[PDB]
């Protein structure tokens, strides 16, 4: 094993849950976090955003 300053390219299994829309919930997407009511959108992101 070695870790360093750790510009990592390998990790083990990452967790997940079902998607709980329309409730106040404590959330993590891709490692970005907050608390809120998640809900469906008319907004049109670009494919990389």
């Amino acid at each position: 094993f070695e870790l360093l300053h750790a510009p990592a390219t390998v990790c083990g299994p990452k967790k997940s849950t079902n998607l709980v829309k329309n409730k106040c919930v404590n959330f993590n997407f891709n490692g970005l976090t907050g608390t809120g009511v998640l809900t469906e959108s008319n907004k049109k992101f670009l494919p990389f955003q």
Partner: peptide, 28 residues
């Protein structure tokens, strides 16, 4: 606007480059 295509974790200290052959170049 230019949009991201490729994003490579590789850790190198780049200081030179070359083309594999009109074609321009400008430094950020």
């Amino acid at each position: 606007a230019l949009e991201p295509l490729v994003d490579l974790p590789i850790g190198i200290n780049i200081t030179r480059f070359q083309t594999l052959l009109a074609y321009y170049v400008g430094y950020l």
